[PDB]
């Protein structure tokens, strides 16, 4: 009479699944169980998250000190998990779903904020955004490996970029900003706004 595990998965991927008629409940247990099996398959295919063991333990202690699993407790767990993610400078991280494999196993789905594209926007002295790929080759270097597509965005990597390029003295204003990628669900665009001196 309890809850045995909290899994925490990171989800981007894609899904199918179709449907059918002739709903003999005797049978339609077929579909409603194929969905459970597919969910288990997804939970194993999925990538584990950045949550460390101490915070897993704290969430599980919250879950044990309250025998029954209530939605308010899930809200508090979400608050704690997002607190950890943001404390480590994972600004874009967010919980999106609380699934179940059975009433005893809770599945928390997070979007960590993976980087899908790198964007460098140049602005002329007066702030009017202009084009120009003469500085792009040098600004591509002096960028941490961790800002490239294939990593989870962290504000610390943003600060490292903001200082490496800062050291060249080529811009009067440097900003690194994550933005929600409209072409990808949960993906993040790292845009780097550079404003020139004079």
């Amino acid at each position, epitope marked *: 009479d309890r809850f045995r595990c909290i899994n925490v998965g990171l989800m981007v991927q894609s899904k199918p699944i179709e449907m059918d008629s002739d709903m003999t*409940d005797k049978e339609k247990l077929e579909y409603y169980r194929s969905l459970e099996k597919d969910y288990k398959r997804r939970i194993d295919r999925a990538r584990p998250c950045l949550l460390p063991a101490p915070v897993y333990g704290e969430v599980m202690q919250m879950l044990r000190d309250q025998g029954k699993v209530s939605a308010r407790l899930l809200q508090r767990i979400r608050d704690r998990v997002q607190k950890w993610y943001h404390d480590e400078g994972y600004a874009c991280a967010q*919980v999106v779903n609380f699934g*179940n494999l059975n009433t005893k196993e809770v599945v928390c789905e997070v979007v960590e904020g993976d980087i899908t594209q790198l964007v460098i926007q140049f602005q002329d002295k007066l702030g009017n955004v202009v084009e120009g790929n003469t500085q792009v080759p040098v600004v591509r270097r002096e960028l941490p490996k961790q800002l490239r597509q294939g990593y989870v965005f962290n504000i610390e990597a943003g600060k490292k970029a903001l200082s490496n390029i800062n050291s060249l003295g080529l811009f009067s204003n440097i900003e690194v900003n994550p933005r929600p990628d409209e072409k990808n669900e949960g993906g993040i665009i790292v845009e780097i706004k550079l404003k020139e001196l004079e």
Partner: antibody
Framework: SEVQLVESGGGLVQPGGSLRLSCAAS????????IHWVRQAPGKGLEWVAS????????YYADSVKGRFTISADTSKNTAYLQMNSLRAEDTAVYYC?????????????WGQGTLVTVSS | DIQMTQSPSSLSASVGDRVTITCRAS??????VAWYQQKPGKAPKLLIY???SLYSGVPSRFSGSRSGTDFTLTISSLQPEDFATYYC?????????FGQGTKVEIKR
């Protein structure tokens, strides 16, 4: 193939009274499903009131009803029940009984016919 | 508390239009959203069980779609038999929450 729900009980009661509603489960095996009670006020929206967990006997109630209603189920006759106590006028509604497979992750597919509970002096 | 905001309260449409009803969860906590159609004097019927999955024996004109905390029910060519009230519903574990409803009426 599509054998369905009948809500029984329900009627007129006075403020402070009590009532018990039955819900007869014909054609499905309500271990794999969860039984929920939802009430619709006169000419108003839908409001979830109570739920029972599949397999295990975990009981969940809405805060508007907590402390006066108790959900239950008899596995033998394929039945679920809803006990209403310290009844108030705001409980006047139609009371539906509907199943959802699994726990808290799928849709209320098969609903009942309904039953009216009028709470008036 | 978790709260769905369903909009519009009512819309008027003609037979053949593509109608879109949206409802928004107050927090990103659950993708377990369902769509129901209820005609007056009767019991609600299930249209959409997962956030976008078409339920059995429902006509193909009904569609579901999700964008963050935004859920959308969509009818391609409104038939006469689709004039009713529509409700969206979410499963935050025990918290079963319904939208306020959308009444689909005849344009005139």
């Amino acid at each position: 193939s599509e054998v369905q729900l009948v809500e029984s009980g329900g009627g007129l009661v006075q403020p402070g009274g009590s009532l018990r509603l039955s819900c007869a489960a014909s054609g499905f095996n309500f271990y794999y499903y969860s039984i929920h009670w939802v009430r619709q006020a006169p000419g108003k929206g839908l409001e979830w009131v109570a739920s029972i967990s599949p397999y295990s006997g975990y009981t969940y109630y809405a805060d508007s009803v907590k402390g006066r209603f108790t959900i239950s189920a008899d596995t033998s006759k394929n039945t679920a029940y809803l006990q209403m106590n310290s009844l108030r006028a705001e409980d006047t509604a139609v009371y539906y009984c509907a199943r959802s497979y699994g726990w808290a992750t799928y849709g209320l597919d098969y609903w009942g016919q309904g039953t009216l509970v009028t709470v008036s002096s | 508390d978790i709260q769905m905001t369903q909009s519009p309260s009512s819309l008027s449409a003609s037979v053949g239009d593509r109608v879109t009803i949206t409802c928004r969860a107050s927090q990103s906590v659950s993708s377990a959203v369902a769509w129901y159609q209820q005609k007056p004097g009767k019991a609600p019927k299930l249209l959409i069980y997962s956030a976008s999955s078409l339920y059995s024996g429902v006509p193909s004109r009904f569609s579901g779609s999700r964008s963050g905390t935004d859920f959308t029910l969509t009818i391609s060519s409104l038939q006469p038999e689709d004039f009713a009230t529509y409700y969206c519903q979410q499963h935050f574990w025990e918290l079963i929450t319904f939208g306020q409803g959308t009444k689909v009426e005849i344009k005139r």
